[model samples]
Target: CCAPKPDDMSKVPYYKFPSVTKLRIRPPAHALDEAYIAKYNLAISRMKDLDKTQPDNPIGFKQQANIHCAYCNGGYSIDGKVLQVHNSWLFFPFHRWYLYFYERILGSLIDDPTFGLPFWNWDHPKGMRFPPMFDVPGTALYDERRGDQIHNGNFIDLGSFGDQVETTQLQLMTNNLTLMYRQLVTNSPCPLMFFGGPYTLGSTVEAAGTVENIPHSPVHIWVGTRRGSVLPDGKISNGEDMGNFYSAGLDPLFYCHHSNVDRMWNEWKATGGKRTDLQNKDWLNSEFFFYDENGNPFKVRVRDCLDTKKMGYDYQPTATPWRNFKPKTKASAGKVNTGSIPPESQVFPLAKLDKAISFSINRPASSRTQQEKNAQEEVLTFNAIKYDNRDYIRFDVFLNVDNNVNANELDKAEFAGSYTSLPHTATATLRLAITELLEDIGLEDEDTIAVTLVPKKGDISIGGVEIKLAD
Candidate 1:
């Protein structure tokens, strides 16, 4: 949730939609109060301590009884005896509700009395920490290098990428951008735009994995973000690289990944777009429900989520002075708001249990370039560390209600679970993969950790092994 400071707002140019950066925060009503900042920081500090000292608690066994969730969440090809295992698709809704809960926790942490969530704007022009990747130990999700690599708006020379893209991937990219932008604003009952969208089609054509126009656009630079992709072979790995999400360990950026996804739409609206979507029509009208932090179930409609401000919430972005190519412009644009508000904060409650798992690379599978398989392997090997002794493992459990798992009774659902090392222990490498589920709420399951196991110190590699899923 980046916003410009009073002294700098006048100096930076306001970037348009599909290109907003997190560097500029919504205006603050007053300079942030030092007392409030300390309080907010202190609360997050306490959250860390609480998570560290507590042992993993089962979801419903006495201490875990009040905890309600699907027991077996990992989706392993549910259809047949072949090897097409699948992680339950319900992992989508589960985390949505989970993040909703965390927002409340965060509000309580800041004791702001009206703490709203922050948005990490990586879509528009700005500077510093564009992607918001949390690259530290334990549960804090982030990307360390993102701050340094924010987008500069420099493109592939209008004449270079191709004479013009006359048939440019424009619609595909726009559609992809639209779908993600729509979802960011609405946060559907279930994650929306998974199987269909422009990004997906473009990806399939490129033989790359599914790519989402989440971080504002298919072309990374549009949003002022550094050029990035999972495939390391120097190919267009935008869609096929499973670099970050599929790795065996829990990657903290998983949450930030989604956070940026959610922010894309917010930025779009802020850029002066109508900020409305066709979701109200028959092909898109849908309703979904989930339990709020207080443990009460509520149904939501795509129509209702159109306005984040109307929804009565805002994201908590980091504070950085907004810097840009041109001078600052209008007070607002598109339908997005660019104004001042009090600084607010929220912290997530640690999950009831902390189980971990370590999976091995099975084989080389390519959703993109054949070499992407090797890139995937290297990402897994270097970005993440090897758990030679399974005893050091932990689990990240998520309920999957898609397969007869009942949310009516929290204890009666099937859940998916996995494990990984702390964020600091992960290998540092890159891979070309697509962003899927958990793109909402801008976060991932609390227990997941993503690691990059590279061929060298931080080069993605390819290998094969099997990780036993613990009950």
Candidate 2:
């Protein structure tokens, strides 16, 4: 009977498997807008010094929030409970745009011409296990002490929030973080919601009251993890204190991670969300100033950043336009493999990995050699995502400063990264002109060494390189 049924079924079509519905792919922003980054970078780089003549200074994010509640004629409420959102929430958007503009500015500052946001997609396969190289102490991006021996994933075992993160070793890696306003309004009781974060300017540092109650950044998808147990004791002070939270000023990757956070918020709004923040009118009209690289300061407003397209800029690589913020589904899992090789095939070639150069140093304090430099080859390497046949590499290096070798006061090693990727296998030499190392630790010129580097991102890779120094 089955054979007879099959004979008639020959004329009938067979059933086909259903199509797999993929995740909604959000398109990326345009390429690095050279002109915009230059303009913004100049704005930020020159923020340190500004004409103090203007008396009507725009308040900071905190001040702006308080002022808006006390003065502005808009109806922006927090959680339908509080009369108004505190100044802390304002910084979420302010810092978001600040980093956005800063990235453009940084790109232009160095004149790399094509620098895009460097994502901390440490959640991916290669990124799952903590790359041993990132465990290096004091790296601007990689904190050797903060990693746990737990498995990497987005799950929490039944434990305290911090304990869960620590035990799971899961990468606190998320790119699209909405604001914490939801939790802030509906969840906890703390007025200053964000737990001891580095960017929070004005707030009393509080110790953890309970394990279950954790603060979230509603406006952004912050990338850092909660369990940072390995940082130095001074840097790892417990409780909710600003000093304990890691930041861009402390870790350079903070800047890149924040840059992407800013982009995510921008992308969210670009899709269809009413620029309700824009509707608030006065909220976007306020003007403020921040310090630049050269010890200068300048005044700016939310309006200035409203149109990144008008600013004449875009991000690097895909050259994605300014408006689209969706995660575009690529034909393949395209990650730039940052192996030790020069990146020449891409539109913008990465600077070669050079020797870790050091200059003279007068030290009566710490010895530069005391810093950990475990020559584990795998630990020394950073692999980027694959881009077509080419892949990018983030070559890591540590530079030390020592002049007379008598005192070790100004002895410090500056961490730097270089991008490259080539099948042929090439290496770069790093060089450093000790500018002022003691400045960070507070010492005389003899005890100082300036750690300078040419920061690189985008499509690149590295094969290998030699370590050399001059003077």
Candidate 3:
């Protein structure tokens, strides 16, 4: 039911396999060898050249970019409902399948079955800057619409889209590593939490997971945007190539960027703690429409892409050096005040969070079944997040924390997650699984829990916050 549609509904042809002989190993762009770079440019140049030809370039480069635009911009629908891949369980699987076919097409172009897509290993220290080969003018990889900071050779900024604070190189590197550990390890402890809330038949939308929420969205914004270029919704278009979804695929770097994002999906599971893919029938049955390497219309299912090796491609083995760091905080949860916690019926006053705010909320755990529900996964949602998409905004969520909390105690269970966005007229809800975090904070049986919202970048407002046991 989560199937994506093309511009025109072409016949769903068989997904004929390319003449692939070996597993296409995707290498890191920062470390791609000179000979491989030359070959890669040649392959890309050929793909671009296809614009002038016919069936050989049938699903040409512009069409490849349009595939993303169609799927994302309400061009496709599921039984009349708009079908969007991002901010839901389909986010990872859809993008993963997309790049696979894209790589196959590129490989088929140059008749080099061994050609693999390279990744921008931004999580590593050496990959802080955008890949060097992409910066060269007149090259197939270069994109003129990239941000000025990227043009000036600035390092990656996973959070804070444009209003970034000045910091030392080592300090910036340390912070980024800590962020990776927090989002990948501490915040995401299960597959559903990492994959995101389900988006299936009859379900209009679902919240995104930690990885998709932070580094994923932030990377897109930073790469495409210059500074604060947000404009009125009824006014002019921002036209940022990589920053917004409509224009993301137009850039070659989008593929390289997603290579690392896809790499992190593998990395997340490798962290253990019983991390695995969701086995839901709905998720497994969802189909996506695409054009194959031979310019034939093709249909693929979510189940087909659960494993990368099965698809005949694997990323270059790389180190997760960022896992070494964790967010530290000085605040301690010596004793939580559950008696005075606000209950579900208590409606807190409407507040505009132009800055940070902290408080506590009561959970409906007054019975045995309620306690049992908390024993499993507990989901927290920030609903109706009202924000002006014309400005870059970031707001971090924390659990069971006090105003006096310092940076050292941030790494503890109090740190729930964060939701940041670049300029865009957008809408969605935020969800974070907190069963393990509650246990870590020793509040699994408590009647109430602490909550905090810190505005890290732009001003945003939220309608309400609720906690419910995961279904």
Candidate 4:
């Protein structure tokens, strides 16, 4: 049985696999030896040569790429309805299953059960530059869809943008290291904050986790979008290959990029804190479908992938330079809020948002007890719904706007970090941990909090916005 497309979920039969007791270990691409690299490329070349028209050719390049497009950009139909996989908790689990089977197919092509996909270690300083193995010409791993400027020794920016200005290589490396510290260490510490909002059957798009939002989306944009010349529309154009969801998987680099993201999930878990998987049954029970090396379909539940050790692989260990780093000043706050907060939401029409949407929140003048005043953790979320999958949109958020609005200026303290919409999905969500933002601006409980959303592109609309205060 081949992998199912946008077909009915219940009507589609479940796939069963032969029971195995042992697990296989996956190593990073940069760490692989010459022999392993050669074998890996050989398997890939074989898969590339397979005919697309054959019924048994489930592992062909086109079929593999379609798996990503259908489940993401085109929206998979389950039980006569569409289900979105990205922008929610389903994102991590879905991709894990997708990669697992793809790895198996690659190994089977070369008749090697120990073979594992090589992951690009972008999180490390040495790996900030593109790996050299993929650069060789006449190899099955090579694809011209990648940007020409992204070559060896070029430091990658985790928070990259389309119209990026030039910076020193050393400065770029320092910024990437600092960003890794913030994204993995200071920001995400809990399950809900790390895995993103929940989505099972009925949700359109939920909020993305910190890792998924920052380095994940930004890296995709940086790699695929070329900035050589301005477009006729007066905006920088992103390369069609990896920048958007419809064609991202066509490039071999896409798999390498995702492998690094999957590695981050393992890295985050090792750091001691509240970092763990969600206990909700909705998340654990969610299942996804994929095809093995023999083109046999298999249904795997989220519960099946909770442990990487049990899943048959582990990431190659590397130095985490950002782990021990601490923010120098009070403006860069490290204190995390651990209290519970009931969420409140509001929806805005997409067509009407031409300039900006301004909203005010008034906290109670004086809560009866001192305990209430001390609970100051607040989170502000901005969400855009029903966006086209072809282009990327970035927005600048402001707290109590007064004078000039410049998203490029890093010195401005009031400017909350920007939000780049996720590709291929109808809805996108971003969260600004306002505990530090409010403290930096000297806002209090009685004060009316004013916020604004300024878009670089007019194609987006606000589906809803929410503010949650810690109880």
Candidate 5:
């Protein structure tokens, strides 16, 4: 009976289930295995002693951070409106049913239904720092307000987009595995560019795909900042607890950074081309509700979470250095022009970083046929709408560089490709697979391209910059 809807918010109490025939797999809190880290710290110290003796338990821990601050701060509401689940496609099946009843209420508080929940493997590189077993001592997965600059021996910067760059540590693990190979394989090929847009049933926030925009909002603003100082436009302002969103799921590594963003949506369809899921039936009749681990209450749809082994658990086969990168070789040149054009709108006002903002695309000239412009593929999206959310903006994407180029070629990474924005978030996109910067500035497809936008700090305003064609 798909219950829980009548407005206002906080509405638990509704039971009905028969699906999910138990699964549980979840490993990778840096590959746990000391008897599954002492039964996940005795199921988080017995769910914090049942939140200190049933303090209105419902999967306690302050009702599991009020189930992510009642559906992402505002505490729910649907008939009277307001049910935003972090930008579109109901943000990965409403946090995969809020971590499937927070991993079945920590495996029903240790009664163990094959417990499994420990994902913070920040895209490898030795699990990109910060899971020092959540700084032990006095367990329940401790969390003394994560800040102290990602604890002592830092690291994690899966392209932290809220500014804080000094690089080294092997260039932040080779820019966090080349930003997980440019946001999961040279910019997710499909499924609304990998889950984004559409929030069926009275929508609100619709824009955040590419793995919830970069290593999921820059690993929650790089594990809620606080390494102090440095911001004369360099980025790294105090990150209030897991950085925003109503105190980011009360830390605890925000459920191990959303279980590595739900294991990168099952390793983005196991790294296959034109990924799937979201055949819209309003996104498989979107729905959400949670309380299991005996607190009952079920209801979960989104096509029953597009299989994670039938919502039991999965995600433990790590490393995927951009799975066979294929920066084009082994040939090309067939069926191109998947059509897409829209550039000139002019807004670019990203307040100073020593100015630099260009956009000159132009196509027509028998469009493409030089073998479909050498097997086409060009994308440069960068829409925005952020006005100071406490700095951390690194947008460096230069192509036809001018105004005196070569400031060390603006620190090459193949003609720049970095975008990280946080603070009062909503609308901040970035996708760049400019076909090897148009084959390193040789250009084709009726050339006229000259895209640029460099900012290493705050303030935002560019609202548009599209140039698609890579179905």
Candidate 6:
């Protein structure tokens, strides 16, 4: 799976800077005042209004979109190896530096140094829909190729693929809040759990951080999918802009969607655990080239991205209601139901996952040396997951919980994490950190861990299931 090499970056241009000393506040899109939105819309329109012809108008709107596409869709490769920003540790920093410059360009266009990129606060209930600011027709923020039917002007699914069957709005909020709590607080206590696993020179797997796999992935899918062959006109445009990666940057809403993702880097650290940026040199020092607002080109390193305050920006103060969410535990929690479902190894291929399957994964918990115990994390991996990207895919992971537990009960202590991806075909490994959850349920010393896979939807096939101590 090699990607085409990128064109030379020998003589790109460069602008001076935006100082962190004059901090800009990236407010929630839903919270923007009408006057501010007016300025923001016109700024965006100006960018979109620019001529996309290169050499003369290098940093125009489409150029910005192409930059995203170039970096992601096999446009850039080093030493013959393809480079990608998503699905790995680079997911956060690359996007960070990108938005940093994009915001600068927007501010420069409006002659307002105070301008900040708006963020869609999808983690909170009210902030879930496509920010009403972007929804208004005949506006710079509006796009025709979006899945309006899925959300139906209500809360977007925090744990969705492309679409879902909703009942009461209150219950949807409940499920969403629980999902938020589970992803940020419970599932992500370590860097590998949140920032995603490493993507070294030869590594092929695109490991997505917990929230990125769900809310981040689904938002794009939900926003892009036209839903149920439903379109205002005879035309349709699902997966055209916000849904697909390369073209996602073409939409103004994409920037706001990612602004919240960058916000997570700040919020995750605020949660107070072992959560922090990875210290790997390759990760911290990786280089990326981009054009500044002045039509100048510059290289940014991941080390330069860790501090948003240094970048001259920070997200507005917002409440995370999901932080306090707690799910009702069945009286039988902390105890594994000794069911006779086949062991994952014995079954070999756990393909055709429409039904629930729980396999006993043998982990020699006591085999760890004292020093390595805390240094390593226990991960449940679905090896080489194969599925079509055109359909919504969801499979929940439960640890030490009975196979009989209801699949819809996402708020339980035993629910370790969830893997959900939007439309696109591909084979990739899925991992979930169960270290913190194992300790919480008093199963840290257990030699065997019960791993459950509840395939709620999609035509998915798993090459194998493996549980190991990943450092």
Cα lDDT, all candidates: 0.27, 0.28, 0.72, 0.65, 0.63, 0.75
| TM value for model 3 | 0.85
**lDDT (Cα, 0-100) at 307 in candidate 6:** 88
**In candidate 3, how many Å is residue 424 off?**
4.0
Sort by TM-score, top down from the best: 6, 3, 4, 2, 1, 5
Q: Which scores greater on TM-score, model 5 or model 6?
A: 6
| Candidate 1 structure quality by residue, lDDT tens digits, 1-471 | 011112222233421212321222232212335554444345444444444464232210111111211222122111221111112122222333333444455455545545533333333223213332232333233223222222342222111111122223333233223333223332221222221222111121111111132222222222211224433355432222112122211222333334444444444345343233434252233333333433333444445555555544555543322212111221112221112211111111111122221222222222334344223221111122233321122221222111222211111111121222211112211121111222221112222222111110111112222221110
lDDT of 2 at 332: 18
Candidate 1 accuracy as TM-score? 0.34
Better of 3 and 5 by TM-score: 3
Each candidate structure's TM-score, on Cα atoms with residue i matched to residue i, is: 0.34, 0.34, 0.85, 0.78, 0.33, 0.90
**Alpha-carbon deviation at 196 in model 2, angstroms:** 19
Clashes in each model (backbone N, CA, C under 3 Å)? 110, 98, 10, 0, 6, 8
Clashing pairs in 4: none
Residue-level lDDT tens digits of model 4 in 1-471 = 123452446754565444673466666666568898799789887787774456347688767877888787535654443445677787787887788888878878899876777788888887877777777778877776666557645767666755453566765676577567656754564676677876554555657777787788877776675633453455554565677677788777788788878888888889654678777897887777676778766567788887877777777677877675443423222322212211123425445455655555444342324454344335666655446655566666766653244433333345555566545446666766655455555564434566666666537767666666533
Cα lDDT of model 5 overall? Answer: 0.63
Model 5 spans with C-alpha error above 4 angstroms: 1-22, 25-42, 46-113, 118-142, 147-186, 190-213, 229-251, 258-262, 270-353, 359-366, 369-376, 379-393, 396-418, 421-431, 434-445, 456-471
Per-residue lDDT over 347-405 for candidate 6, one digit per residue giving the tens place of the 0 to 100 score: 65865787777777777464456577568776777787878867678888887765576
lDDT, model 1:
0.27
The alpha-carbon deviation from the true structure for residue 69 of candidate 6, after best TM-score superposition, in angstroms, is 2.0
lDDT for model 6 comes to 0.75
* Root-mean-square deviation of every model: 23.2, 27.5, 4.4, 6.3, 19.5, 3.3
